[PDB]
Amino acid sequence: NDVATAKATGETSAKVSINKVLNIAEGITTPEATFTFTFTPKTGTSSNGAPYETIDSSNGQITDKNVSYSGTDVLATGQTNIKKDTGDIFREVNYTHAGEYVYTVAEKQNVGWKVIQKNGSPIDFMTYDNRNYEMHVIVKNKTTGGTYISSVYFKQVSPSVNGKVKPSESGTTYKYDLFTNIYRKNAGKITDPNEPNPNKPSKVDPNAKSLVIKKVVSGATADKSKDFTFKLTFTKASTETSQSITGKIGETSKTFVYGQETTITLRHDQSLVFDTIPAGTRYKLVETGSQGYTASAAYKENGASKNQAGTVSTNFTQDSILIGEKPNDNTITNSLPDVTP
């Protein structure tokens, strides 16, 4: 009932569900896409010498099964894995003669919504799983009656794994986390702050900057030409292969390629923009607090504009704010009190 994983049942049909794992970053709202799984029969020989008795002639035809995702789904402070399973794939299917029935389970590509685009220029990037699997169904006869699904196990044929595929949840419905997909979205301000998530509109600009950081100086008796020092530590995301956000760009005059640890300098009305950068990227801002200057900030973690302030002549640490799928900005204002008359 757990011999090298596999499925289990007593004189009853086994129930099996394919689980689709979808990888996603923090800021991003779940897209509206569907994934499709093909059950194509395969021939060969079994343990007994049965010719993989396979019929698709009305009998033993496993039709394709679907898992859909919508905006209504949420990785509620979970993993980078919003998982959704099929039903029993063996509902509505009937067997006729018994023996070993073998199928080649795969997933089609281009079946979903990487089509969150403007003028053909995309914002996102749906990455599919084009693995090939092999599913063995072992149908035996009931002592009085007809057929019952005794056992089912899987194997991978693409990456040559000489091992049974392990389950997710053993029990009533055996669940199997077969296909794992990744939804990358270079967001930032690319999505506008008008909740146009389910409804694509077109409130989107593909060439909008991701993050914009201004240094503002406040006060009459304040230096507009002082170069204030910022220590920025931008983190990567789940669905980001860019090595420590290799291409963190962020150009004032030079590239300033970032990645996990950096330091920059700004004057009044001077800004450093990162164009078209992935979502789910968190960042730590630390300004070296100058003598007599009080530092404050008015940012946009997702499309929600927030503010934080510090103290006079004190280093200003922001504890991991997030660049997400809706607008992302920050205006760091440095104020100095004007000398009393």
Side-chain angles (χ1 to χ4, degrees), residues 105 133-136 153-161 163-165 178:
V105 190
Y133 281 94
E134 197 178 4
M135 177 169 72
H136 298 221
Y153 72 82
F154 297 81
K155 241 204 162 189
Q156 340 204 288
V157 342
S158 152
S160 64
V161 177
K164 304 280 196 286
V165 176
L178 269 99

Tab-separated table of all heavy atoms in Angstrom, residues 105 132-136 153-165 178, unseen atoms left out:
chain	number	residue	atom	x	y	z
A	105	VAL	N	2.267	10.843	-20.452
A	105	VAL	CA	1.688	12.062	-19.921
A	105	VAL	C	2.669	13.205	-20.155
A	105	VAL	O	3.832	13.111	-19.785
A	105	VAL	CB	1.358	11.892	-18.427
A	105	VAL	CG1	0.531	13.059	-17.899
A	105	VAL	CG2	0.583	10.608	-18.205
A	132	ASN	N	8.476	14.875	-20.328
A	132	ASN	CA	7.670	13.733	-20.722
A	132	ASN	C	7.669	12.731	-19.571
A	132	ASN	O	8.705	12.475	-18.968
A	132	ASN	CB	8.088	13.146	-22.073
A	132	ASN	CG	9.580	13.141	-22.260
A	133	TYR	N	6.482	12.189	-19.265
A	133	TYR	CA	6.270	11.201	-18.218
A	133	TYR	C	5.591	9.959	-18.795
A	133	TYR	O	5.006	9.990	-19.874
A	133	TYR	CB	5.335	11.761	-17.144
A	133	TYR	CG	5.984	12.702	-16.169
A	133	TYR	CD1	5.963	14.075	-16.375
A	133	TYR	CD2	6.586	12.225	-15.022
A	133	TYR	CE1	6.551	14.949	-15.474
A	133	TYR	CE2	7.151	13.091	-14.101
A	133	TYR	CZ	7.158	14.456	-14.335
A	133	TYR	OH	7.732	15.322	-13.450
A	134	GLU	N	5.655	8.857	-18.041
A	134	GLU	CA	5.022	7.617	-18.449
A	134	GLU	C	4.228	7.078	-17.268
A	134	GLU	O	4.776	6.888	-16.185
A	134	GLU	CB	6.065	6.606	-18.913
A	134	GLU	CG	5.483	5.463	-19.713
A	134	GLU	CD	6.504	4.465	-20.230
A	134	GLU	OE1	7.701	4.609	-19.902
A	134	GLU	OE2	6.109	3.571	-21.000
A	135	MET	N	2.933	6.855	-17.504
A	135	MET	CA	2.008	6.461	-16.460
A	135	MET	C	1.532	5.042	-16.729
A	135	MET	O	0.984	4.766	-17.786
A	135	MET	CB	0.792	7.386	-16.460
A	135	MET	CG	-0.254	7.018	-15.448
A	135	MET	SD	-1.478	8.346	-15.301
A	135	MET	CE	-2.314	8.116	-16.861
A	136	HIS	N	1.718	4.165	-15.745
A	136	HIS	CA	1.279	2.787	-15.853
A	136	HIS	C	0.023	2.611	-15.008
A	136	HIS	O	0.030	2.916	-13.822
A	136	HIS	CB	2.384	1.840	-15.378
A	136	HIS	CG	3.638	1.894	-16.180
A	136	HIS	ND1	4.339	0.766	-16.518
A	136	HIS	CD2	4.326	2.923	-16.706
A	136	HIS	CE1	5.395	1.092	-17.233
A	136	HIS	NE2	5.419	2.404	-17.351
A	153	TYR	N	1.481	4.027	-11.198
A	153	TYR	CA	2.739	4.665	-10.872
A	153	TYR	C	3.221	5.429	-12.092
A	153	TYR	O	2.740	5.183	-13.191
A	153	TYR	CB	3.759	3.647	-10.367
A	153	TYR	CG	4.338	2.716	-11.404
A	153	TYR	CD1	5.389	3.103	-12.223
A	153	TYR	CD2	3.883	1.413	-11.519
A	153	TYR	CE1	5.956	2.233	-13.142
A	153	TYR	CE2	4.431	0.528	-12.441
A	153	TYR	CZ	5.480	0.938	-13.244
A	153	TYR	OH	6.015	0.093	-14.173
A	154	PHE	N	4.137	6.378	-11.869
A	154	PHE	CA	4.686	7.202	-12.928
A	154	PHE	C	6.194	7.033	-12.999
A	154	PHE	O	6.823	6.563	-12.059
A	154	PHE	CB	4.459	8.686	-12.637
A	154	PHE	CG	3.021	9.125	-12.565
A	154	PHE	CD1	2.281	8.932	-11.409
A	154	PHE	CD2	2.398	9.698	-13.661
A	154	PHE	CE1	0.953	9.320	-11.346
A	154	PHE	CE2	1.079	10.114	-13.590
A	154	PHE	CZ	0.355	9.919	-12.435
A	155	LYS	N	6.774	7.477	-14.114
A	155	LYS	CA	8.216	7.486	-14.307
A	155	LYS	C	8.523	8.650	-15.236
A	155	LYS	O	7.650	9.043	-16.000
A	155	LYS	CB	8.671	6.163	-14.927
A	155	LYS	CG	9.655	5.363	-14.077
A	155	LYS	CD	10.497	4.410	-14.887
A	155	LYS	CE	11.724	3.970	-14.116
A	155	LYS	NZ	12.686	3.196	-14.936
A	156	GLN	N	9.740	9.192	-15.174
A	156	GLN	CA	10.104	10.264	-16.090
A	156	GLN	C	10.989	9.675	-17.192
A	156	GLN	O	11.924	8.923	-16.889
A	156	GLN	CB	10.815	11.420	-15.365
A	156	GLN	CG	10.593	11.464	-13.866
A	156	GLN	CD	10.794	12.860	-13.332
A	156	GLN	OE1	11.912	13.356	-13.247
A	157	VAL	N	10.700	10.032	-18.448
A	157	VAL	CA	11.388	9.471	-19.606
A	157	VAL	C	12.330	10.529	-20.176
A	157	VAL	O	13.330	10.188	-20.816
A	157	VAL	CB	10.419	8.978	-20.706
A	157	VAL	CG1	9.006	8.779	-20.196
A	158	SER	N	11.986	11.817	-19.996
A	158	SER	CA	12.850	12.874	-20.503
A	158	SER	C	14.151	12.864	-19.702
A	158	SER	O	15.210	12.754	-20.319
A	158	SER	CB	12.166	14.228	-20.612
A	158	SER	OG	13.084	15.306	-20.477
A	159	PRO	N	14.156	13.148	-18.375
A	159	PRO	CA	15.414	13.217	-17.634
A	159	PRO	C	15.965	11.895	-17.118
A	159	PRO	O	16.727	11.906	-16.171
A	159	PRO	CB	15.054	14.168	-16.478
A	159	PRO	CG	13.611	13.839	-16.231
A	159	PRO	CD	13.000	13.611	-17.588
A	160	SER	N	15.588	10.762	-17.713
A	160	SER	CA	16.065	9.434	-17.353
A	160	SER	C	16.216	9.201	-15.843
A	160	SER	O	17.333	8.961	-15.374
A	160	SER	CB	17.350	9.122	-18.074
A	160	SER	OG	18.390	10.002	-17.672
A	161	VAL	N	15.113	9.332	-15.077
A	161	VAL	CA	15.149	9.011	-13.656
A	161	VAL	C	14.732	7.555	-13.497
A	161	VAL	O	13.559	7.272	-13.703
A	161	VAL	CB	14.251	9.962	-12.850
A	161	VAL	CG1	14.220	9.610	-11.368
A	161	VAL	CG2	14.722	11.389	-13.027
A	162	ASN	N	15.664	6.683	-13.076
A	162	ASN	CA	15.360	5.274	-12.865
A	162	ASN	C	14.735	5.090	-11.485
A	162	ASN	O	15.272	4.342	-10.664
A	162	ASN	CB	16.571	4.359	-13.082
A	163	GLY	N	13.606	5.760	-11.259
A	163	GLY	CA	12.916	5.684	-9.984
A	163	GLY	C	11.440	6.014	-10.153
A	163	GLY	O	11.087	6.797	-11.027
A	164	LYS	N	10.592	5.403	-9.315
A	164	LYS	CA	9.181	5.730	-9.306
A	164	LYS	C	9.019	7.173	-8.835
A	164	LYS	O	9.677	7.612	-7.887
A	164	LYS	CB	8.425	4.729	-8.424
A	164	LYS	CG	8.609	3.275	-8.826
A	164	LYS	CD	7.733	2.870	-9.978
A	164	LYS	CE	7.645	1.373	-10.118
A	164	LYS	NZ	8.900	0.838	-10.684
A	165	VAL	N	8.100	7.897	-9.476
A	165	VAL	CA	7.741	9.233	-9.026
A	165	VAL	C	6.947	9.142	-7.722
A	165	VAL	O	5.935	8.446	-7.643
A	165	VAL	CB	6.982	10.019	-10.111
A	165	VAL	CG1	6.501	11.382	-9.635
A	165	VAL	CG2	7.832	10.176	-11.349
A	178	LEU	N	3.359	16.767	-10.535
A	178	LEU	CA	4.071	16.440	-11.762
A	178	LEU	C	4.701	17.671	-12.413
A	178	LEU	O	5.913	17.701	-12.583
A	178	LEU	CB	3.127	15.735	-12.740
A	178	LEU	CG	3.068	14.213	-12.662
A	178	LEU	CD1	1.855	13.762	-11.866
A	178	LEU	CD2	2.993	13.619	-14.058
